[PDB]
Amino acid sequence: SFKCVNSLKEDHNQPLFGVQFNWHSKEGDPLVFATVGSNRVTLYECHSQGEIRLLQSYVDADADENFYTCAWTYDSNTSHPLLAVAGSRGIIRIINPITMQCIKHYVGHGNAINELKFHPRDPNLLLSVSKDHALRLWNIQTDTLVAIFGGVEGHRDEVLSADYDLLGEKIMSCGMDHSLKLWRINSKRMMNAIKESYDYNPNKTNRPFISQKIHFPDFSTRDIHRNYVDCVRWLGDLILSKSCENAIVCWKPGKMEDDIDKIKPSESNVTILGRFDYSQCDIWYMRFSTDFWQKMLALGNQVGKLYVWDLEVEDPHKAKCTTLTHHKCGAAIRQTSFSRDSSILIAVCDDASIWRWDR
Ligand SMILES: Cc1ccc(-c2cnc(NCc3c(F)ccc4c3CCO4)n3cnc(S(C)(=O)=O)c23)c(C)n1
Ligand SMILES: Cc1ccc(-c2cnc(NCc3c(F)ccc4c3CCO4)n3cnc(S(C)(=O)=O)c23)c(C)n1
Ligand code: NA
């Protein structure tokens, strides 16, 4: 079971909106996690006796920047970890976590970026989701915009979250229009766009890189939640998503026995496989997370309580819940992160505090 071994507070005293363990950290190296809040990104190392060792921060030159998200990848030639961050300015920064140097930045969108995710099988492909109602897929090896997911049948309001499935063949996005939308990226059009992004070298051609504009999702529903959908994750062929209605819903497109790859864009049904209720988490902008193996699900609430669900059961509705509290932890938990082996769970709060729970 989990025990609270340490806590820390960042000097900016502003909310921490994101936290991610580096699941690409090398064997024998201590566990490292990044936090994002205010106009900063900070790295920490987990040590024995609950020690949280402070390393170094990246501080944006714009005091008005507010980082909302971060995601780890690694350099495709050297294997060294890389960290991407973004937020209110709509700028994607690729940071070398060793020196905390910004090694490249993309003017990602014409509005804030709410989430960043790297492709599960390709470390060069970065997905950003924005307040401009679109998703964008970047190839950070050739600095190209592969595709824009949005348009005439895309999201109709700010996009808050998105996730790749296990194989990275498809994306599920969600946002302020109450909808969850599916975008297949294993179509002939998208596989060709990705191949061409890798073949693009602006020094060796005259053409600009032509980005795809994908105006139509492969599936859409507004039948799961009745408010802003602010977090989505795939659980195999099933989806986990939440709104501010004190519930994570586990569902799937189509009827009970419909295969996800047979779902057509006109599909009008959804199937609910279960719902994980909790309390006092009815404010917008609260994230849930799963561990590496997807054996566990974690979410913090607006009064500092953590809920952890054991997903190692025959059906989703049988998930077993554990609650974790500490008398000194009373601020809203915006995001959690498990270490790759799930031995540590970190929670970050609105009062700039960091909470470490060891298994
Ligand atoms: C005819 C052809 C076209 C495209 C690709 C291709 C595709 N997708 C990624 N990555 C994303 C990725 C992946 F990793 C695993 C599964 C997956 C995807 C995208 C959708 O399903 N690629 C990376 N390099 C390439 S390459 C060798 O430069 O083309 C790809 C391939 C293999 N063949
Ligand atoms: C005082 C203050 C400042 C900023 C934010 C905030 C926070 N996070 C994102 N996005 C990241 C994001 C998200 F999209 C979905 C879920 C989620 C998060 C962060 C944690 O769980 N924001 C986007 N717009 C805003 S805003 C400025 O209110 O419109 C935010 C909050 C809640 N409070
Ligand atoms: Na830079």
From Swiss-Prot:
Modifications after synthesis and translation: Methylated. Binding to histone H1 'Lys-26' promotes mono-, di-, and trimethylation of internal lysines.
Tissue specificity field: Expressed in brain, colon, heart, kidney, liver, lung, muscle, ovary, peripheral blood leukocytes, pancreas, placenta, prostate, spleen, small intestine, testis, thymus and uterus. Appears to be overexpressed in breast and colon cancer.
Coiled coil ranges: none
Recorded GO MF terms: chromatin binding; enzyme activator activity; identical protein binding; methylated histone binding; transcription corepressor binding
Keyword check for Repressor: yes
Disease per record: Cohen-Gibson syndrome: An autosomal dominant overgrowth disorder characterized by accelerated osseous maturation, advanced bone age, skeletal abnormalities including flaring of the metaphyses of the long bones, large hands with long fingers and camptodactyly, scoliosis, cervical spine anomalies, dysmorphic facial features, and variable intellectual disability.
Protein name per UniProt: Polycomb protein EED
Organism: Homo sapiens (Human)
The encoding gene: EED
